[PDB]
Design a protein around this ligand. Structure first.
Ligand code: OGA
Ligand code: MG
Ligand code: NI
Ligand code: ZN
Length: 331
């Protein structure tokens, strides 16, 4: 078995290897990459997502989210308070302000320490889930706006034609902006490209050990657990590396820098934070190996997790028994 310790692997494809996305994902899995839940892909040096980022300031963040924390430093939840719209230029200025900017630090480890120590005492503002792309249409390789669609994958593998579309989303981050512990909708893959700015630190649990994280989360967030049998789908709970170590949960961590891709694999729980002003783009995708994960994916039926139009069809076709109750949650 390749990669038996489930380490995060880092890949450096050549420009030739960067042509066929599906084939490279399948290559990575042949080397065991999926066992970690997360992989880093450094693009060939010849490749670029677009020519410059000089003209992005007028993108609108229609609903910036203020991430308010509750709990203790290593075990907290966050709630997203909606704020008034602002441009990316306005947001970058805010991110760079004295109130929100990254503190002085020695290296990524010292900044990680400061994040876990101090995150709860601040409420950074996140521009998340903004439909759109920053890839130039002329970028032909690993262009997250030109991937094959999950609906087309399901059709190719299973023969069923379904409605729905699959488009990317932009994320504008600042210091301390946080992504809570989650897997993807329907335990899909994700791919995330850090277009610009400061790094993003990731933590991940190997898929084969995801239930260990779930069991800890039910112990640590006991009222949330009683309220919903898949409450990590709410994307609000954080647990620090120190806490994970204290409870024997297997995990790994890695820092993504501008110009790098990360891939999350089916049922790879992940969480993380941004080091400073940055912009990422991400999208879900599928492969043949995903299908069985999609069939087994948990679902939130309490009604909090409230998810896309396109997830309907996935549930309907892959989880017909759940369909009924899950759609009661979504209506
Ligand atoms: O970058 C973020 O805030 C969150 N991204 C992801 O969870 C991802 O790409 O799967
Ligand atoms: Mg603009
Ligand atoms: Ni994710
Ligand atoms: Zn729920």
């Amino acid at each position: 078995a390749q990669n038996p310790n489930c380490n995060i692997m880092i890949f450096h494809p050549t420009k030739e290897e960067f042509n066929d996305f599906d084939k490279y994902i399948a290559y990575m899995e042949s080397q065991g990459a999926h066992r970690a839940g997360l992989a880093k892909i450094i693009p060939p040096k010849e490749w670029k997502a677009r020519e410059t980022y000089d003209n992005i300031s007028e993108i609108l963040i229609a609903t910036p989210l203020q991430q308010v924390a509750s709990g203790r430093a290593g075990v907290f939840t966050q709630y997203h308070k909606k704020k008034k719209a602002m441009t990316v230029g306005e947001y970058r200025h805010l991110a760079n302000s004295k109130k929100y900017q990254t503190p002085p630090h020695q290296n990524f480890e010292d900044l990680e320490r400061k994040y876990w120590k101090n995150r709860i005492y601040n409420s950074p503002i996140y521009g998340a889930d903004i439909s759109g792309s920053l890839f130039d249409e002329n970028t032909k390789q690993w262009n997250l706006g030109h991937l094959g669609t999950i609906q087309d994958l399901l059709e190719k593998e299973c023969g069923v034609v379904i409605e729905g579309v699959n488009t990317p989303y932009l994320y504008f981050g600042m210091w301390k902006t946080t992504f809570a512990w989650h897997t993807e909708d329907m335990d899909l893959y994700s791919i995330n490209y850090l277009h610009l700015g400061e790094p993003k630190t990731w933590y991940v649990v190997p898929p084969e050990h995801g239930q260990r994280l779930e069991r800890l989360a039910r112990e640590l967030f006991p009222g949330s657990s009683r309220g919903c049998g898949a409450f990590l789908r709410h994307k609000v709970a954080l647990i620090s590396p120190t806490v994970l170590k204290e409870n024997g949960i297997p995990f790994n961590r890695i820092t993504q820098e501008a110009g790098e891709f990360m891939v999350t694999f089916p049922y790879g729980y992940h969480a993380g934070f941004n080091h400073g002003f940055n912009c990422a783009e991400a999208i879900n995708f599928a492969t043949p190996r995903w299908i069985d994960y999609g069939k087994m994916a948990s679902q939130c039926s309490c009604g909090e997790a409230r998810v896309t139009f396109s997830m309907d069809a996935f549930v309907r076709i892959l989880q017909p028994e759940r369909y009924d109750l899950w759609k009661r949650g979504q209506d």
